[PDB]
Structures are given as structure tokens and as C-alpha cells.
Design a protein around this ligand. Structure first.
Ligand code: CA
Ligand code: CA
Lengths: 158, 31
């Protein structure tokens, strides 16, 4: 149900990598893994919950208590954790970056405005790069990105 | 095959970090 959201919130290459690790600890080959393997799988993909937090998670996902979790369950949870653990800029400071980024002040940052950004940087951002940044950032697909969408994209970024 | 995407997500996460700097930098020059 509230899964597709979690799916949406994650990029294509992320869900592609998450699987990889998941499948890795899936001998049963039933798109299933033991809750005693969660902590370690979550470690492979950046997350570092404390054993007490991993216990909380196990209680949430596996409520009925079978000792395993599927991939859609993995997703939904991984995303919540990623969010919880977040440690990026606040709303105030992130909104100021936004207005720096919105040249015409239409309430969006568009493809063109995007590449206008890395120009100030000494880096070389490929056309696709710009397109992928907007791709994951674009959630209603309006072709651009508004503040609220800019928040998610900036979630816990340093 | 999955090494690439690992890189893809990395590069992306990095560019977002850059964005914040560019922004920050520009926000100081506003003085
Ligand atoms: Ca704009
Ligand atoms: Ca959008």
C-alpha cells in the first residue's frame, strides 16, 4: 500500500542496489531474508542504526512475527530510516539556497537553472547528470522542482 | 553492472553537496 511511495522516494539505481544486497542474503530465493540479517544488510547500504534501533525496526516491519521481511517491506523501512537518520540543513537554510537557485522566482528550479548552478563550480556536470538530478528530484514530473521537492532531494545532505 | 549505479548515486550525492556550497558561498557574497 504505502509502499509505492517508498519506491518513488528512492531512485532507480538505489532500488537496483538495495535489491542486490537483499537478494544476496536470500538463499530461500523467495524474495525473503531473516530478521537476523537485517542489521548487516542495512550496513552494506549505508545505514547504521543502533542495535536498539534495529530492534525497533524489526518490531515495526515484522509485527506478526515470522522472522523475515520482503523487499517491499525492506524498501518502505529503509526509506523511513534514511529519513529519520537524516542530518542535513534545516528548512530555513535550505529555502535560502532555493531562492539562490530560482533566478526568475517562479517557485521552481528548472533544468536550465540547474546547469546554471554548477557553472559557479569548477566541475564538469554532464547533460545526463543534470537530467538525473532533476529526475530523482522531480516527483510530480512537472519537469522542474519546487521547494517541497527540493527539501526531499536535499534530505540529509552535507 | 551494479558497480556503475553505486557510482551513479555517489556522483549525484556529491553534486548535491556542491550545490549547497555554491549556494552558501553566493549567500556570503551578498554582503
Ligand atoms: Ca525558476
Ligand atoms: Ca516536480
Amino acid at each position: 500500500d504505502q509502499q509505492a511511495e517508498a519506491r518513488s522516494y528512492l531512485s532507480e539505481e538505489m532500488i537496483a542496489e538495495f535489491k542486490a544486497a537483499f537478494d544476496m542474503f536470500d538463499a530461500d530465493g523467495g524474495g525473503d531474508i531473516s530478521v537476523k540479517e537485517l542489521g548487516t544488510v542495512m550496513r552494506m547500504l549505508g545505514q547504521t542504526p543502533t542495535k536498539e534501533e534495529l530492534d525497533a525496526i524489526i518490531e515495526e516491519v515484522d509485527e506478526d512475527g515470522s522472522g523475515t521481511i520482503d523487499f517491499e517491506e525492506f524498501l518502505v523501512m529503509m526509506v523511513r530510516q534514511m529519513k529519520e537518520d537524516a542530518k542535513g540543513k534545516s528548512e530555513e537554510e535550505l529555502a535560502e539556497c532555493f531562492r539562490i537557485f530560482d533566478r526568475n522566482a517562479d517557485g521552481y528550479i528548472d533544468a536550465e537553472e540547474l546547469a546554471e548552478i554548477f557553472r559557479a563550480s569548477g566541475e564538469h556536470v554532464t547533460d545526463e547528470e543534470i537530467e538525473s538530478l532533476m529526475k530523482d528530484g522531480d516527483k510530480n514530473n512537472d519537469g522542474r522542482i519546487d521547494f517541497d521537492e527540493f527539501l526531499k532531494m536535499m534530505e540529509g545532505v552535507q | 553492472e551494479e558497480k556503475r549505479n553505486r557510482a551513479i548515486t555517489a556522483r549525484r550525492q556529491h553534486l548535491k553537496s556542491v550545490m549547497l556550497q555554491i549556494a552558501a558561498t553566493e549567500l556570503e557574497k551578498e554582503e
